[PDB]
Structure 1
Amino acid sequence: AHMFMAENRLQLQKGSAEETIERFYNRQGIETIEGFQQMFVTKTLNTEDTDEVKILTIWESEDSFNNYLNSDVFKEAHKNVRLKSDDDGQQSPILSNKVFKYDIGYHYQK
């Protein structure tokens, strides 16, 4: 069975990458989720006028990802997550998010 990766790509107001990444430091239950293997939270290195933060999650299967999305644990972790565009998103530097999905065809870990 092929592993699976999801990417949540966040476009952020310039300068806000570091404060946004810090939100991911403390766990909110992902460690309890069936099929979850790893998470990376990254800042893209470039000269763009917005920041880009990506959340990569590695899963034993797409199904395990799908089940996480429907889970109480996911819902709870995201209850206070808002976008700049939301009516109550005044304090949010998160301009947009876009989800990308991938088959992991090969993995090596030293």
Structure 2
Amino acid sequence: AHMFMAENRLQLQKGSAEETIERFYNRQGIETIEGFQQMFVTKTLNTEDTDEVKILTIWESEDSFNNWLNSDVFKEAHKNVRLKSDDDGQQSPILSNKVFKYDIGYHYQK
């Protein structure tokens, strides 16, 4: 079976990538889901408009990822997360998210 990747792509106010990335430093349970393998948190370089941060999660299968989405740990990690558009979210630099899903056709680790 091929590995699977899920990306959450954060659209952020200009300059807010760093303060946003720091929120991802301490784990909140994703690592306890069977089939979770790796996570990367990236800042897109050379952006001229909004900042862009991507959260890449690598899994044994799409099923594993779905299991995390359906978990209480997913809820607990996101319980205080607000978009700028939320009623109490005016101060958030997070404008929107978009999820992308991928089949990993090849992987190599040195």
Distance 2:18 2:85 in 1: 20
Structure 2 unaligned blocks of 5 or more: none
Q: Percent identity?
A: 99
Q: Which runs of 4+ in 1 moved over 2 A?
A: none
Indicate the larger mover: 55-64 or 82-91.
82-91
RMSD (Å), alpha carbons: 0.7
Matched residues, number: 110
For normalisation by structure 2, the TM-score amounts to 0.97
Distance 2:27 2:67 in 1: 18
For normalisation by structure 1, the TM-score amounts to 0.97
Indicate the larger mover: 13-22 or 24-33.
24-33
Structure 1 unaligned blocks of 5 or more: none
Q: Report the CA distance between 1:47 and its aligned residue.
A: 3.4
What is the SS of the residue equivalent to 2:24? coil
Indicate the larger mover: 100-109 or 81-90.
81-90
Indicate the larger mover: 96-105 or 44-53.
44-53
Distance 1:73 1:13 in 2: 27
